[PDB]
Amino acid sequence: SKSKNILVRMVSEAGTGFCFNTKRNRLREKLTLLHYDPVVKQRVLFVEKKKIRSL
Amino acid sequence: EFKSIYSLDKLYPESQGSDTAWRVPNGSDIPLDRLTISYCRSSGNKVNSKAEVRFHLATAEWIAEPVRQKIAITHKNKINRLGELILTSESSRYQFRNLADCLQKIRDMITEASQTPKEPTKEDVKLHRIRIENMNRERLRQKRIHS
Amino acid sequence: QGGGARALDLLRGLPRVSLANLKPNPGSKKPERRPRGRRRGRKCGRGHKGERQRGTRPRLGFEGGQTPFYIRIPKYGFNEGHSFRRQYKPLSLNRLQYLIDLGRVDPSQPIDLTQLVNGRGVTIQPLKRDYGVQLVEEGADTFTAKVNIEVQLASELAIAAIEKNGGVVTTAFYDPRSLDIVCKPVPFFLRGQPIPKRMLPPEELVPYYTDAKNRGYLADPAKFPEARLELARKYGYILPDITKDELFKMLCTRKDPRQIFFGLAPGWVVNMADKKILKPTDENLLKYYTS
Amino acid sequence: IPDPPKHEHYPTPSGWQPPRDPPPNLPYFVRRSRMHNIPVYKDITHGNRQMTVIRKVEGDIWALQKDVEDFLSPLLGKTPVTQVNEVTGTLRIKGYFDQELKAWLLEKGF
Amino acid sequence: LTYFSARKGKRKTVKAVIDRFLRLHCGLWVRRKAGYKKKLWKKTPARKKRLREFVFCNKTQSKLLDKMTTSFWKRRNWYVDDPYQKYHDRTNLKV
RNA sequence: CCGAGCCUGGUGAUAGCUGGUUGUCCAAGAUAGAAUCUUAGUUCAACUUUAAAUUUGCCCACAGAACCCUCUAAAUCCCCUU
RNA sequence: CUCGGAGCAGAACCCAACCUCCGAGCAGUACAUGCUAAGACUUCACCAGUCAAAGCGAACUACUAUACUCAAUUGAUCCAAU
Numbered sequence: 001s002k003s004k005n006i007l008v009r010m011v012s013e014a015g016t017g018f019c020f021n022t023k024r025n026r027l028r029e030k031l032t033l034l035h036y037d038p039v040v041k042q043r044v045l046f047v048e049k050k051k052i053r054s055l
Numbered sequence: 056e057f058k059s060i061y062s063l064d065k066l067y068p069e070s071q072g073s074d075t076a077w078r079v080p081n082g083s084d085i086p087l088d089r090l091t092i093s094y095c096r097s098s099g100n101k102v103n104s105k106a107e108v109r110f111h112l113a114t115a116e117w118i119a120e121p122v123r124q125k126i127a128i129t130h131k132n133k134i135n136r137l138g139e140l141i142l143t144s145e146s147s148r149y150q151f152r153n154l155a156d157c158l159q160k161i162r163d164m165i166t167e168a169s170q171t172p173k174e175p176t177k178e179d180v181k182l183h184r185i186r187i188e189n190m191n192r193e194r195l196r197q198k199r200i201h202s
Numbered sequence: 203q204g205g206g207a208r209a210l211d212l213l214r215g216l217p218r219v220s221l222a223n224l225k226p227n228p229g230s231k232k233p234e235r236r237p238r239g240r241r242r243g244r245k246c247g248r249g250h251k252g253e254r255q256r257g258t259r260p261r262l263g264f265e266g267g268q269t270p271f272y273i274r275i276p277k278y279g280f281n282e283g284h285s286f287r288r289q290y291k292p293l294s295l296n297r298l299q300y301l302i303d304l305g306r307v308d309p310s311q312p313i314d315l316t317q318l319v320n321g322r323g324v325t326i327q328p329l330k331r332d333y334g335v336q337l338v339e340e341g342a343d344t345f346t347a348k349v350n351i352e353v354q355l356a357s358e359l360a361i362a363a364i365e366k367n368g369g370v371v372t373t374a375f376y377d378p379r380s381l382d383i384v385c386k387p388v389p390f391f392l393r394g395q396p397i398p399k400r401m402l403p404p405e406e407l408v409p410y411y412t413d414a415k416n417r418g419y420l421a422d423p424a425k426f427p428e429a430r431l432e433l434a435r436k437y438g439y440i441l442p443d444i445t446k447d448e449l450f451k452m453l454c455t456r457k458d459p460r461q462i463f464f465g466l467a468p469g470w471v472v473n474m475a476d477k478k479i480l481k482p483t484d485e486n487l488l489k490y491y492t493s
Numbered sequence: 494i495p496d497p498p499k500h501e502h503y504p505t506p507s508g509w510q511p512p513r514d515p516p517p518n519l520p521y522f523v524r525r526s527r528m529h530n531i532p533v534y535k536d537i538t539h540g541n542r543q544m545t546v547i548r549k550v551e552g553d554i555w556a557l558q559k560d561v562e563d564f565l566s567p568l569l570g571k572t573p574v575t576q577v578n579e580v581t582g583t584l585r586i587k588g589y590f591d592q593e594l595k596a597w598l599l600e601k602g603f
Numbered sequence: 604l605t606y607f608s609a610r611k612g613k614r615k616t617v618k619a620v621i622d623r624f625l626r627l628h629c630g631l632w633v634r635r636k637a638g639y640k641k642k643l644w645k646k647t648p649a650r651k652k653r654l655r656e657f658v659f660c661n662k663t664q665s666k667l668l669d670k671m672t673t674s675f676w677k678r679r680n681w682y683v684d685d686p687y688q689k690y691h692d693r694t695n696l697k698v
Numbered sequence: 699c700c701g702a703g704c705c706u707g708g709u710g711a712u713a714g715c716u717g718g719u720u721g722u723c724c725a726a727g728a729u730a731g732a733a734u735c736u737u738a739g740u741u742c743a744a745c746u747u748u749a750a751a752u753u754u755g756c757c758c759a760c761a762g763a764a765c766c767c768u769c770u771a772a773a774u775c776c777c778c779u780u
Numbered sequence: 781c782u783c784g785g786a787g788c789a790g791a792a793c794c795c796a797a798c799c800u801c802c803g804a805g806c807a808g809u810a811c812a813u814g815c816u817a818a819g820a821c822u823u824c825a826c827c828a829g830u831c832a833a834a835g836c837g838a839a840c841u842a843c844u845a846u847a848c849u850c851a852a853u854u855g856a857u858c859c860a861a862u
């Protein structure tokens with residue numbers, strides 16, 4: 001049960017405070033995705049802020 | 056009578072006199088007398104009630120002349136043979152609310168015609184195939200050989 | 203006609219009614235069931251052994267050991283703070299018009315919470331976190347009456363129906379203590395207590411009563427005309443001028459926000475045995491019952 | 494309870510109408526309640542059995558059953574199921590006919 | 604359950620039912636789904652959609668919950684601007 | 699009758715375990731299963747009983763329900779009519 | 781000792797043994813795996829679980845795209861952290 005991947009928290013850069021959790025490989029740089037933000041109703045950049053747990 | 060610190064005269068000293076809240080201001084966009092109103096049950100069992108409103112468009116002089124002509128083009132499908140503009144509403148049980156909706160439709164007609172909006176609004180999806188149908192009906196058109 | 207006498211002329215020939223020949227109406231007394239005899243004896247309906255026959259069943263809700271149904275469901279605040287929410291018994295315009303057509307509520311005098319209770323129009327339960335009545339719009343089309351009613355809540359359409367016929371509607375706040383006194387005054391006059399001044403509404407409810415659109419009793423009287431005209435334009439009715447009416451003096455009549463009843467200032471002690479009213483003269487008491 | 498005031502036009506905005514004067518010369522009579530309304534009520538038991546009750550019936554109550562069975566049969570297409578209680582002077586009918594019977598009893602002036 | 608209290612001699616109410624369920628005057632009981640806040644990262648949007656829905660209970664459950672509560676919780680309330688006010692009465696229901 | 703005395707009291711201790719459970723007469727009435735420190739028990743369902751409301755239920759004609767595959771099974775499901 | 785596939789159980793569903801065999805307690809790709817909503821299936825109860833038209837909003841003029849591949853690939857309530 002080696003924890004290959006981890007659960008992280010992606011925060012929007014629009015300042016809306018909207019965030020979602022995604023899965024990424026441990027040995028990898030922090031993610032910068034382009035996810036949909038329902039507050040502003042358009043796709044916006046997200047960034048990994050903090051790790052939740054080890055999958 | 057009894058008076059307390061929280062009396063209206065003390066709270067609002069610039070509003071004295073009993074006949075201060077019941078004075079109809081004398082300083083009138085839609086006159087009711089110039090409108091024909093009807094109430095009738097709809098699909099009765101259906102709960103909602105219907106309130107019809109009709110009035111002659113041209114004879115009515117409480118609307119700007121250019122607006123009448125602008126309204127007799129846009130809402131030409133709501134005009135009968137005689138010339139009356141009909142406005143129904145059956146989205147409530149109470150005749151009050153149904154009449155309020157019809158009256159507000161008139162205030163919206165006089166604003167659209169006066170705003171003169173010429174902005175490129177979004178095209179409807181149901182009207183996108185008619186634009187193609189009409190376009191292709193013009194390239195079938197022909198000119199007389201000898202005009 | 204015939205049936206009434208048939209049952210009394212037929213009683214003339216029968217024996218005298220007495221304590222012997224009485225019986226209950228059939229179908230009103232089921233037979234008692236006792237654990238005796240072959241049918242109902244022996245095990246006596248309890249079954250054979252187990253916890254069933256010995257009367258040691260587990261509590262209600264116990265499912266035999268697996269996490270019960272009422273415990274495996276998460277908690278949600280459906281009823282969080284239910285004892286501190288305000289309730290208002292609805293009063294429909296159909297009900298009000300029905301009370302007026304029967305004489306149970308007279309429209310010639312101001313209609314308040316007391317007159318409605320005295321006419322059995324509503325039933326307020328102050329101990330059940332009731333704060334008054336809310337005037338609802340049901341029966342607005344058929345409503346035809348000119349009244350001066352005071353209700354703690356009122357909808358925008360109910361106001362229009364009363365202001366269309368030439369009436370006046372006002373919204374006032376009664377605290378739980380005053381609400382019990384306004385509904386049942388007589389039981390309060392038997393306590394030998396002076397009439398108390400009602401309190402102001404909580405901070406959250408001040409906007410509602412300080413607004414003219416809700417016909418608030420703490421609102422600016424100068425803003426009512428413009429608000430009365432809006433409903434007329436919106437709902438298509440001609441705003442009548444009540445100043446011309448003869449009942450105008452009665453419609454304007456309103457009680458001081460610190461007042462409970464009409465013509466009875468706070469501080470007085472009603473004496474029902476002698477039909478007299480006692481008023482304090484102490485300079486300090488007068489200032490307490492006037493502020 | 495106060496007696497209802499006299500009105501110029503009947504029925505009133507609420508729909509109340511006073512009884513006819515004199516009383517109709519029928520074998521039976523249905524008097525008003527203490528609140529001056531027709532005594533026709535809806536009853537229900539077991540969550541599925543809908544009934545209608547006519548109380549405060551004086552005189553021959555079997556003639557009222559005949560008049561009701563002759564007035565409701567067209568609406569149903571069949572003779573309605575009723576129950577008569579001579580003791581209590583009550584008529585009990587299967588089904589909801591509250592508004593239909595209140596108007597029919599007003600035409601007779603009860 | 605306590606059928607007869609030792610001080611008042613009356614039936615008591617189970618407060619574990621009041622913190623989880625809502626009773627409509629008609630007789631229906633509304634609840635949440637078990638697990639609508641647990642491990643949302645491994646569940647699908649469709650499953651999460653029906654997990655945060657307020658659902659009804661059955662006859663056997665509702666009869667039990669009515670026995671575990673007193674008559675005070677079955678009365679008709681007139682709260683101001685209640686989100687469930689329209690659900691306290693049934694419409695066009697037969698049998 | 700000391701693996702821990704006797705008496706009284708708390709005490710009508712508790713016991714999913716055993717035993718017992720008192721007049722007459724008629725009627726309907728044998729039950730897939732799931733969970734459970736649970737299989738000597740209980741709760742839900744199923745069966746069973748009573749009252750009520752309503753309209754279909756049982757029996758069943760064609761047509762119709764898979765390839766991969768070893769017994770090319772007895773049959774079932776669905777189903778108007780009757 | 782929970783979960784899944786096959787046989788026993790041949791053809792709708794269901795079916796046991798300290799019966800016979802093989803497996804699971806993940807991984808990978810996306811980042812609209814966004815919101816919402818008719819109608820339905822359901823491991824014989826409940827709990828849980830499952831499939832979904834239309835619609836909003838996106839994408840799109842190529843991608844068998846508009847409920848990802850994958851068989852199981854999992855853990856209620858209270859409580860704690862925030």
Ligand SMILES: [K+]
Pocket residue numbers: none
């Ligand atoms: K027996």
Ligand SMILES: [K+]
Pocket residue numbers: 239240241242243244245246247
């Ligand atoms: K027996």
Ligand SMILES: [K+]
Pocket residue numbers: 716
């Ligand atoms: K034995």
Ligand SMILES: [K+]
Pocket residue numbers: 714738739
């Ligand atoms: K046991």
Ligand SMILES: [Mg+2]
Pocket residue numbers: 251
């Ligand atoms: Mg025994």
Ligand SMILES: [Mg+2]
Pocket residue numbers: 250251252
């Ligand atoms: Mg046993």
Ligand SMILES: [Mg+2]
Pocket residue numbers: 536537
């Ligand atoms: Mg009843």
Ligand SMILES: [Mg+2]
Pocket residue numbers: none
């Ligand atoms: Mg014992």
Ligand SMILES: [Mg+2]
Pocket residue numbers: none
């Ligand atoms: Mg037998």
Ligand SMILES: [Mg+2]
Pocket residue numbers: 735
């Ligand atoms: Mg356990």
Ligand SMILES: [Mg+2]
Pocket residue numbers: 737
């Ligand atoms: Mg067992």
Ligand SMILES: [Mg+2]
Pocket residue numbers: 777
């Ligand atoms: Mg058949």
Ligand SMILES: [Mg+2]
Pocket residue numbers: 822
């Ligand atoms: Mg099932």
Ligand SMILES: [Mg+2]
Pocket residue numbers: none
């Ligand atoms: Mg779709």
